[PDB]
Amino acid sequence: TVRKNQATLTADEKRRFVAAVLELKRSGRYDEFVRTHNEFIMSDTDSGERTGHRSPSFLPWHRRFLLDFEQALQSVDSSVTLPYWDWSADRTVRASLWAPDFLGGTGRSTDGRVMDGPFAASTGNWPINVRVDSRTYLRRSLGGSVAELPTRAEVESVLAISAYDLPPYNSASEGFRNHLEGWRGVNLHNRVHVWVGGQMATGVSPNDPVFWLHHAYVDKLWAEWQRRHPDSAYVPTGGTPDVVDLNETMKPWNTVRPADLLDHTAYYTFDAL
Amino acid sequence: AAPESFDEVYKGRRIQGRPAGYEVFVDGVQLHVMRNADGSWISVVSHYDPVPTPRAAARAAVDELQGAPLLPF
Ligand SMILES: [O-][O-]
Ligand SMILES: [Cu+2]
Ligand SMILES: [Cu+2]
């Protein structure tokens, strides 16, 4: 399994990825990923139990969530793997990512509605069902709510942080995980959600297929961090209330721990790391 | 200490907030909101974008909705 930069996919690979995503939507499986993510972001809190966000397990949780989604794609077309979006490089609305043969573009200004590409509401193939905003069409406002995506120099400054995470292991933490997540510092992952807008800015953000490509690149940045800091590792390592320690299992699966997910190469490699 | 309650019409929509740890409503429909450790707030329709107060989060939700009804969580 090789996860490839979206910018590098062949026309055949884009066609096959889109058709697999549309089939998971048609079959009803896709919307349960959206529901699971919203359930965790509504329950993950800074002073209580926190697993999928604002906590050290943000990274292994999303790694396993993406693995579940990739396996579901492979059950439809075994050649498909999740691509990643390097938003530091492909940083404008002209990026091929946003072309009509791939994810389609930004939404129109009046109501945010995406008007082209395979996920446009007009196709009939991308109903927004799991939602809080009652509107049922995919929406985006690229660069509307924040003007720029992170740059490579900004990503580099976060990659250079030696500690994986630090007490109090939440949105106030210093350390790599919270700087990558974005609640402190120059802000990488959260800012990308805000920059896409529409459903990507909400707890039902997997409603936009770009969710997976964003989180596949976040996941790659974890892998790069590890290679920069072979001497540093996941923390905490035991006995921490409300936080998933290294060898503790994680909801909702219950049968996997951060320890099982640190080495991505048991599951996939990157085109280049 | 929780923030004070509020009630106003913002861009044509009634927004209300009250301590509960805090609840917000948009035209009577409850909106999930959450407080961050640094005292900022987010809502479920702006859950990656901290703002300073629960009223700011309710206003961000009205801005997000562009007139649409909120559905309950
Ligand atoms: O991660 O949303
Ligand atoms: Cu929340
Ligand atoms: Cu999220």
CA distance A202 to B21: 20
Phi, psi of A229 (to 5 degrees): -140, 65
* Cβ <8 Å between A47 and B37: yes
CA distance A241 to A118: 44
- Nearest CA to A156 out of A182, A128, A188 is that of A188
Residue B43: strand, helix, or coil: strand
* Cβ <8 Å between B36 and A202: no
- Determine the residue of chain A that is closest to B38 in CA distance: A172
B31 C-alpha to ligand 2 centroid (Å): 10
Q: Report yes or no: A257 and A238 within 8 Å, Cβ to Cβ.
A: no
Identity of the residue numbered A204: V
Q: Which residue range is the domain that position A222 belongs to?
A: 1-273
What is the total count of domains within chain A? Answer: 1
Q: Which pair of tokens denotes residue A130?
A: 């799991």
The answer to whether domain B5-66 has CATH 3.30.70.100 is no
Residues of B in contact with A45 (CB under 8 A): 34
CA distance A210 to A207: 9
B1's CB contacts (< 8 A; 6+ apart) are: none
* Cβ <8 Å between A132 and B73: yes
Residue A153: strand, helix, or coil: helix
Experimentally, how was this structure solved? X-ray
Residues with C-beta atoms within 5 A of ion ligand 2 = A 42; B 34
CATH code for position A204? 1.10.1280.10
A69 touches chain B (CB under 8 A): no
How many angstroms separate the first and last alpha carbons of chain B? 25
**Closest-lying ligand 1 atom to the alpha carbon of residue A215:** 1
CA distance A183 to A169: 12
Q: Which pair of tokens denotes residue B47?
A: 């859950």
Identity of the residue numbered A205: S
Cα of B6 to nearest chain A Cα, Å: 22
Q: Using a 6 Å cutoff on CB, does residue A205 contact ligand 1?
A: yes
Data resolution in angstroms: 1.2
Helix-strand-coil percent breakdown of chain A, rounded to 5? 40, 5, 55
Task: Find how far residue B5's CA is from the centre of its chain.
Answer: 11
B69 touches chain A (CB under 8 A): yes
* Cβ <8 Å between B47 and A172: no
- Nearest CA to A58 out of A211, A182, A238, A186 is that of A182
Cα distances from A129 to residues A118, A206, A223, B23, in angstroms, run: 17, 12, 33, 24
The answer to whether the peptide bond before residue A168 is cis (omega within 30 degrees of 0) is yes
What is the per-residue DSSP string for A221-251?
HHHHHHHH-TT---S--S--TTB--TTS--T
Q: Report yes or no: A246 and A60 within 8 Å, Cβ to Cβ.
A: no
Cα of A24 to nearest chain B Cα, Å: 24
B7's CB contacts (< 8 A; 6+ apart) are: B14, B15, B16, B17
Cα distances from A221 to residues A4, A127, A137, A217, A264, in angstroms, run: 14, 32, 31, 6, 12
Task: Find how far residue A160's CA is from the centre of its chain.
Answer: 21
Identity of the residue numbered A146: V
Cα dihedral angle (A50, A52, A57, A62), rounded to 10 degrees? 180
- Nearest CA to B26 out of B50, B5, B9, B2 is that of B9
Please name every residue paired with B23 in a beta bridge, in sequence order, or none if there are none. Answer: B18
Residue with tokens 């995406």, as numbered in its chain: A114
Parallel, antiparallel, or unpaired for β A269-270 and A2-3? parallel
Q: Report yes or no: A149 and A197 within 8 Å, Cβ to Cβ.
A: no
CA distance A66 to A36: 12
